[PDB]
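pipeline stage [seq->struct] | target=Rubredoxin | organism=Pyrococcus furiosus | residues=51
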Amino acid sequence: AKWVCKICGYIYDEDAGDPDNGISPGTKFEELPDDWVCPICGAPKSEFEKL
Ligand SMILES: [Fe+3]
């Protein structure tokens, strides 16, 4: 799945993960740590929408 950061337009792509921030590819948004935030704008998970 892909999730958009409603603040900045960043797309969290579960296939890509966010490795620079400790998230390996294929990590589901729901599996992201609670304290993970948008690597661009710092928005909390609550501000993401599943596409
Ligand atoms: Fe963002």
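stage status: PASS
auto-comment: The chain is about 0% helix and 20% strand. Residues 5, 7-8, 10, 38, 40-41, 43 surround fe (iii) ion (CB under 6 Å).
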